[PDB]
Amino acid sequence: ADGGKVKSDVYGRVEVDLVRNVVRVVESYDIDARMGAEAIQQLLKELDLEALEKELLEEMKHPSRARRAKARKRLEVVRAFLDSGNRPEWMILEAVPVLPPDLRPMVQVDGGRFATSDLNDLYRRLINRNNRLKKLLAQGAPEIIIRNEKRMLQEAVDALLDNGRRGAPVTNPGSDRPLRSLTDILSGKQGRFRQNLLGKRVDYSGRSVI
Amino acid sequence: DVPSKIGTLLDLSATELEQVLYFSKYIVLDPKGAILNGVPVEKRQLLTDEEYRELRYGKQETYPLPPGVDALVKDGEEVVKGQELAPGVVSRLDGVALYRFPRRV
Amino acid sequence: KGEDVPEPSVPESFRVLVKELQALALDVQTLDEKDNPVDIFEG
Amino acid sequence: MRTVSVEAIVEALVAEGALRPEEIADFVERITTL
Amino acid sequence: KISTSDPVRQYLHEIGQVPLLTLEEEVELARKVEEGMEAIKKLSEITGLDPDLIREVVRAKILGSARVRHIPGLKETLDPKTVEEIDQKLKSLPKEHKRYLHIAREGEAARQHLIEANLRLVVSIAKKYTGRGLSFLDLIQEGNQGLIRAVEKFEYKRRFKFSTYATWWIRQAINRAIADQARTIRIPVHMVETINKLSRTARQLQQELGREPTYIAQEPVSLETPIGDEKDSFYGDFIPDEHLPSPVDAATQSLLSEELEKALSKLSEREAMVLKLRKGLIDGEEVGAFFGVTRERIRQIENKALRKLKYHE
Amino acid sequence: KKEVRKVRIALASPEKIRSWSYGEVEKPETINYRTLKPERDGLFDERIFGPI
C-alpha cells in the first residue's frame, strides 16, 4: 500500500476498496487443492516406487502382526510395478483409444431402419461431454459448472469402458437394459476370450440320420 | 477391481477417499498448502467443499436487516465472536463488519 | 485353383483380440523367441 | 455406408433352430415398430 | 455416492449462500461486470492489446490458477510465465490507469458470483425437458452453457432484470442441443417439433377416437439383445450381408453431377436455377417458389423450362 | 516371417495410445440420414480408419 508504506502481515487474498480506500486481506493462500483424476495423475507421477518398497519393507517386518497384512498386500502391487510392469502414471487416461469401426458397426436395416452397436452411443456420449468441456473452458469457467462437466466426463469414460459397475446407462426409455461396454465384449456369454474356445459354426459340414 | 490398484498404491484405505474425490468435487491437498485450519498444511489429507471454501473464499457471512432497523453500521470496521449487530442480528463468525447496501444516508 | 489350402497368415481371432483389447488402454505386444517386437498386422 | 435386408436374416434365424417361427415372429413383429 | 442429489446440494448450497436479492444484489453484480467490460476496453487502448486477451488474463488471476488457454483468434500463449508479465505491466500504469484494473478484477469476479447464484434458475428450466432425449445432467450443462452465454449480452441499463433475461438464452441452448445430440443422426432443426407435434395429437386422438388412421423418423434398436427364450444370442449374430463393394455410388454421382451442370447452364440461369435449388437445395414449394411472380407464371415457366431443357427443337 | 512365441500385456502410455491411432475422432457425428455416408470427422471416418 501507498508504494511501500504499508505491508499486510497475515496470509490472505487481496480486496481493493475504491470508496474507503482500503485493502482487505481474507484468510487464504494458494492452497493447491485439486479434485478428480487430474489430482491423482500427479500423485502417481510424484511417487518413488523404490522408496515405497524400502518403506513398505519396514512397515512389513517391524510393526507387530495384525498390521503388516495390508503392508504385504500393498507391497505386491508396488513390487509388481517395479518389475517388468510400467509407471503407474499411465493408470489414468488423458487419451482414449477408439475401437476400429467394423468391430462395432452401424447398418441400415429395413430400408429406413438402423441397428447400432451400443459402443457407438457410448463413444458419442464421450465426444459430447469432452467437447462441451472444451467450449465451457473457452467461454468462462465458473467452477461448479466445470466440475459438473468433468464429473459427467469421468462417468461417460466409466460408461464405455465398463457398465454395471456404477449403475448402468440406458439407450432410451424403452430398452432399459445396459449398453454393451468394452468390458462386456471380453467376457461373459460369448465375449472374445471364451467364444473361440467355446466353438464356432463351420462351413464344410452337414447332418443326417444314420 | 477387487484389490484397489490405485487405492493400494496411493495410500487412502483403497476405497472411499477415492470414490469420494474422483466422482465428486472433494479434494486432497497437493503440494504446499500453507494456510490455517485446526492444524497446518495437510500434505496428503482430504477435506470437503465446506472447509475448502473456508480456504479459498475466507469466512464471509450475511446478516439480514428488516426494512428499518440498523444498530452499528457505523461500526463498519470491527466485530468480535458473537456480537450484537441489531435487535435480532447476532454474529458468531468473528471478523470485520461491513456495510453491504445502504438505504438511509 | 487346385492348390492346397494355406493356414494363416495371421488368424482373425488373434488380430481382433489385440485391437479389441487395444480399445481399452492395454498395450499388448507380440514377441519373438528372444524377446523382440513382432508386427502381427502384415505391414 | 452399409446395407441389409431383414427378410433373409429372419429366415436364417428360423432355420438356425433357436426357437419356433412363433417366437421369431413375435420378434420381427416387435422389430417392425411399437 | 449416486450423483442425482450431489449436483443439487452443490448448486443449492452456494445458491443458498447467495440467493441474489432481486434488485440490490442482482444489479450490483451486473454493473461491476459492465464496469469491468469498459475498463478492459480502456486498458486495451492504453496498452495496445486485444480486449479479450485482457479479460482472459483477469479470469486466470481471479480463479487463482488454471490451464484454460483459448481465445478467439488466438488459441494459445505461454500461460504461467507471461500472465504475470501482464500483471506487472499493469503495476506500472499509474493511479489514473490502475483503477481500470481494480474495476476489471471486481467485475469479472462478480460475473462468476452472478452465474453461481443464478443456477437454481437452470435447475427449474431444464426440469420441463425431462423425457426429451438427453439426460438431466446433459440438460443442465446445456442450460448452464446458456446462462453463461447470456452473461456476455445482458444490459442492466434497460430496467428488466436478469431472472427473465436468462430464461430465454438458457431455453435457447437447451433447444439448441436437444435438436442435435438426442438421436444418432444430426436431426433437422425442423423435425424436432414436427415429431413432437404428432406425439401430442396422437395423445389427443388416442384419448378418444380409438382408431389408428390413414393420412423419416424412428428410434434405433441396439445391436445386442437376447432374442428367443431370453437366451444367449445377440441380434447382430443373424445378419448375413447384401454385398461388399457398394458400386454405382461414386462412379455414378461423378457422371450424375457433372452432366447436370452442363445442360443446367446451357439454358437461362433464371430458368434452370429456380428448380435446381428449390427441389434441390433446402425444401421442396410452389406456393412461394416465386421470387416475385404469379403462382401461375412460375408453373408456366417452370414446366416450359424443363421442356426446352428436355428436348430442343 | 518371424514366429510369435510370446505375448505380454502392459499398461499403455497415452503417448503410445496416440501412436496406435490414426487421427482423432473430432465430432459426435455418426452418419446422416440424407446420405448414408460418414459425417464430418465422425466415428466412422474413412481418412481415420479406412475405406468402407
- Please check whether residue E295 lies inside any domain of the structure: yes
Most C CBs within 10 A among A192, A200, A204, hence the mutation to make, goes to A192
Task: Give residues 145 to 174 of A whose Cβ lies within 8 Å of E.
Answer: 145, 147-149, 151-152, 155, 167, 171-174
> CB neighbours (10 Å) of residue A171?
18
DSSP secondary structure string for all residues of A144-207: HHHHHHHHHHHHHHHHHH-SSSSS---SSSS--S----TTGGGSSSSTTHHHHHH----SS---
**Chain A residues in contact with C28 (beta carbon < 8 A):** none
Q: Are the CB atoms for A41 and A49 separated by under 8 Å?
A: no
**Helices A37-45 & B16-23, crossing angle to 10 degrees?**
120
From residue E217, alpha-carbon distances to A137, B104, E198 in Å are 35, 64, 11
Which helix (H) or strand (E) element contains residue A72? Answer: helix A68-82
List the one residue out of A104, A154, A85, F50 whose CA is nearest residue C20: A104
What is the 3-class SS of A32-52, one letter each residue?
A: CEECCHHHHHHHHHCCCHHHH
DSSP state of A63: S
- Please check whether residue E227 lies inside any domain of the structure: no
Shared domain for E40 and E122, answered yes or no, is yes
Question: What type of residue sits at position E295?
Answer: R
Give the distance from CA E257 to its chain's centroid.
Answer: 33
Task: Inspect the interface and report whether the beta carbons of B34 and A24 lie closer than 8 Å.
Answer: no
List the one residue out of A191, A195, A190 whose CA is nearest residue A182: A191
Give chain F's largest Cα–Cα span.
49
Q: Which residues pair with F7 in a beta bridge?
A: C30
- Nearest-CA distance from F47 to chain E in Å? 16
Euclidean distance between CA atoms E173 and E138, whole angstroms = 11
Give the distance from CA A52 to its chain's centroid.
Answer: 24
Residue of A nearest to E119 (CA): A145
List the one residue out of A181, D7, A168, A117 whose CA is nearest residue E221: A117
**Chain A residues in contact with D5 (beta carbon < 8 A):** 109-110
Euclidean distance between CA atoms A15 and B90, whole angstroms = 25
At a CB cut-off of 8 Å and minimum separation 6, what does E185 contact?
A: F30, F31, F32, F33
Q: C-alpha angle with apex E269: E263 to E273, nearest 5 degrees?
A: 85
Q: Is A95 exposed, middle or buried (0-12, 13-18, 19+ CB in 10 A)?
A: middle
* Annotated binding-site positions of E: 76, 92, 229, 232
Tell me which of E183, E204, E227 is where a domain ends.
E183
Shared domain for E202 and E161, answered yes or no, is no
Chains C and F touch (3+ CB pairs under 8 A): yes
User: How many CA atoms, within 13 angstroms, populate the side-chain half-sphere of residue E74?
Assistant: 14
Phi/psi of residue A13, nearest 5 degrees: -105, 155
CATH of the domain at E21: 1.20.120.1810
Tell me which of E164, E183, E202 is where a domain ends.
E183
At a CB cut-off of 8 Å and minimum separation 6, what does E162 contact?
A: E26, E30, E114, E118, E150, E154, E156
In the sheet with B27-29, reading across from the earlier edge strand, the strands are A33-34, B27-29, B46-47
- The three three-digit cell numbers of residue F29, written as one number: 457425428
Q: Are the CB atoms for A200 and A208 separated by under 8 Å?
A: no
- Please check whether residue E231 lies inside any domain of the structure: no
Euclidean distance between CA atoms A104 and E223, whole angstroms = 9
Shared domain for E132 and E202, answered yes or no, is no
Task: Inspect the interface and report whether the beta carbons of E184 and F30 lie closer than 8 Å.
Answer: yes
Euclidean distance between CA atoms A182 and E120, whole angstroms = 37
- Please check whether residue E302 lies inside any domain of the structure: yes
CATH of the domain at E279: 1.10.10.10
Tell me which of E138, E158, E183 is where a domain ends.
E183
From residue B56, alpha-carbon distances to A55, B95, E80 in Å are 34, 16, 20
Task: Inspect the interface and report whether the beta carbons of A95 and F25 lie closer than 8 Å.
Answer: no
Shared domain for E166 and E210, answered yes or no, is no
Domain count for chain E, please give it: 3
Euclidean distance between CA atoms B13 and B28, whole angstroms = 14
**Chain F residues in contact with C22 (beta carbon < 8 A):** 12, 20
Task: Inspect the interface and report whether the beta carbons of E185 and F52 lie closer than 8 Å.
Answer: no
- Partners for E (CB, 8 Å, 3+ pairs)? A, B, D, F
DSSP state of F31: B
Q: Are the CB atoms for E291 and E270 separated by under 8 Å?
A: no
Give the distance from CA B7 to its chain's centroid.
Answer: 28
Resolution (Å units)? 4.0
List the one residue out of E233, E211, E213, E208 whose CA is nearest residue E223: E233
Residue of E nearest to B63 (CA): E17
**Chain B residues in contact with A12 (beta carbon < 8 A):** 58
DSSP state of A23: E
- Please check whether residue E232 lies inside any domain of the structure: no
Q: C-alpha angle with apex E38: E35 to E41, nearest 5 degrees?
A: 150
- Partners for C (CB, 8 Å, 3+ pairs)? A, F
Q: C-alpha angle with apex A57: A52 to A60, nearest 5 degrees?
A: 120
E64 Rama sector, left if φ>0, alpha if ψ -120 to 50, beta otherwise? left
Task: Give residues 47 to 76 of E whose Cβ lies within 8 Å of B.
Answer: 64
Euclidean distance between CA atoms A157 and A94, whole angstroms = 11
Shared domain for E136 and E201, answered yes or no, is no
Domain of residue E197, residue span: 187-219
DSSP state of B73: T
- Nearest-CA distance from A160 to chain C in Å? 10
Chains B and C touch (3+ CB pairs under 8 A): no
Give the distance from CA E305 to its chain's centroid.
Answer: 41
Compute the Cα dihedral for E23, E29, E32, E38 and give only its sign: negative
At a CB cut-off of 8 Å and minimum separation 6, what does B11 contact?
A: B44
Shared domain for E11 and E57, answered yes or no, is yes
> CB neighbours (10 Å) of residue E73?
7
At a CB cut-off of 8 Å and minimum separation 6, what does E234 contact?
A: A190, E223, E224, E225, E226
Question: What type of residue sits at position C38?
Answer: V
From residue E170, alpha-carbon distances to E13, E112, E121, E130, E280 in Å are 21, 16, 9, 15, 34
Shared domain for E254 and E215, answered yes or no, is no
List the one residue out of E222, B38, E199 whose CA is nearest residue A115: E222
Euclidean distance between CA atoms A28 and E278, whole angstroms = 65
Q: Is F39 exposed, middle or buried (0-12, 13-18, 19+ CB in 10 A)?
A: middle
Task: Inspect the interface and report whether the beta carbons of D23 and E243 lie closer than 8 Å.
Answer: no
- Partners for B (CB, 8 Å, 3+ pairs)? A, E
- Please check whether residue E240 lies inside any domain of the structure: no
Q: Are the CB atoms for F10 and A85 separated by under 8 Å?
A: yes
> How many beta-carbon pairs below 8 A join chains C and F?
46
Which helix (H) or strand (E) element contains residue A209? Answer: none
Q: Are the CB atoms for F24 and F35 separated by under 8 Å?
A: no
Which helix (H) or strand (E) element contains residue A106? Answer: strand A106-108
What is the 3-class SS of chain E, one letter each residue?
A: CCCCCHHHHHHHHHHHHCCCCCCHHHHHHHHHHHHHHHHHHHHHHHHCCCHHHHHHHHHHHHCCCCCCCCCCCCCCCCHHHHHHHHHHHHHHCCHHHHHHHHHHHHHHHHHHHHHHHCHHHHHHHHHHCCCCCCCHHHHHHHHHHHHHHCCCCCCCCCCCCHHHHHHHHHHHHHHHHHHHHCCCCCCCCCHHHHHHHHCCCHHHHCCCCCCCCCCCCCCCEECCCCCCCCCCCCHHHHCCCCCCCCCCCHHHHHHHHHHHHHHHHHCCHHHHHHHHCCCCCCCCCCCCCCCCCCHHHHHHHHHHHHHHHHCCC
Shared domain for E174 and E192, answered yes or no, is no
Shared domain for E154 and E192, answered yes or no, is no
Most F CBs within 10 A among E142, E185, E243, hence the mutation to make, goes to E185
Whether residue D1 lies within 8 A of chain A, CB to CB, comes out as: yes
Q: C-alpha angle with apex A208: A206 to A209, nearest 5 degrees?
A: 160
Minimum-distance CB partner of D4 among E218, E233, E242: E242
Euclidean distance between CA atoms B103 and B67, whole angstroms = 9
Shared domain for E105 and E156, answered yes or no, is yes
**Helices B16-23 & A143-161, crossing angle to 10 degrees?**
120
Shared domain for E173 and E277, answered yes or no, is no
Counting every residue written for chain E, the total comes to 313
Shared domain for E207 and E286, answered yes or no, is no
DSSP state of C24: T
- Please check whether residue E234 lies inside any domain of the structure: no
Q: 3-class DSSP state for residue F30?
A: coil
- The three three-digit cell numbers of residue E132, written as one number: 426429451
At a CB cut-off of 8 Å and minimum separation 6, what does A34 contact?
A: A42, B27, B28, B30
Rg (CA), chain A: 27
- Please check whether residue E228 lies inside any domain of the structure: no
- The three three-digit cell numbers of residue E152, written as one number: 456476455
